[PDB]
Amino acid sequence: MKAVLFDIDGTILTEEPLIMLFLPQVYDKLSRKLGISKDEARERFLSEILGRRDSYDWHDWNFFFKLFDLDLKYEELLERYPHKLQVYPDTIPTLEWLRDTGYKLGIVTSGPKYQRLKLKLTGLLDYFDVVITRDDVNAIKPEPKIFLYTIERLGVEPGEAVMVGDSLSQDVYGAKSVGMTAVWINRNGDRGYNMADYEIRTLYELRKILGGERV
């Protein structure tokens, strides 16, 4: 193996604390704008998100801010509250080990350009040889282009790369469809449907899967 590719959200970090912080502000701003209750604003906002699942726009918070013409920019929220982004304890030792061992490291995310800002703010950016977001290829997982462009940039063949992510449809199916090895990270004890080549609970388990020999 020569390269390990990572999903971001739910895989190497979580933005859930930031989501918990800004959603009430969204409900506040939306209810005040539309002259409706905060509960009705919540219903409308969340319904729109659910309605656009599995689509290009689903992975972009700014899409939803813009759709409701709200005075919010996710980049500004990120820069203001970077401590609300939480890096999993198993992330940095794993990236350190992989980089030191000689693996090329890539990010493949269906989120937009601010995903790179999230990596910068959490101190993870510099571990990666390349970071590919939706906005870099005009495509989302599991479209083959987003995986193929990433490994092309890394200079490796698909069979020389492993994808690690928490989404069965985006990460596992996406990676396998272009000939990569697929590792599903399952932090919350969900159902895996017998799909991935390997299933792990934390990134520390990658050491058992890959072994320790330099590449």
Residues in contact with Mg ion by the rule CB under 5 A:
7, 9-10, 166
Residue with tokens 């790179």: 116
For Mg ion, the closer CB: 16 or 76: 16
Contact 171, 110 (CB under 8 A): no
For Mg ion, the closer CB: 15 or 166: 166
Q: Which residue is nearest to Mg ion (CB)?
A: 10
Q: Is 54 annotated as a binding residue?
A: no
Q: Give strand pairing partners of 181.
A: 162
For Mg ion, the closer CB: 41 or 146: 146
Helix (H), strand (E) at residue 29: helix 16-34
Q: What is the nearest approach in angstroms of Mg ion to the Cβ of residue 213?
A: 29
Q: What is the nearest approach in angstroms of Mg ion to the Cβ of residue 11?
A: 5
For Mg ion, the closer CB: 158 or 165: 165
Q: What is the nearest approach in angstroms of Mg ion to the Cβ of residue 39?
A: 29
Q: Is 57 annotated as a binding residue?
A: no
Rounded Cα gap, residues 181 and 172, in angstroms: 8
Tokens representing residue 139 in the block = 């495509």
Using a 10 angstrom Cβ sphere, with 0-12 exposed, 13-18 middle and 19 or more buried, the burial of residue 180 is buried
Q: Is 9 annotated as a binding residue?
A: yes
Q: What is the nearest approach in angstroms of Mg ion to the Cβ of residue 155?
A: 25
| Omega of the bond leading into 112 within 30 degrees of 0 (cis) | no
- Which segments are annotated as binding site for Mg(2+)? 7, 9, 166
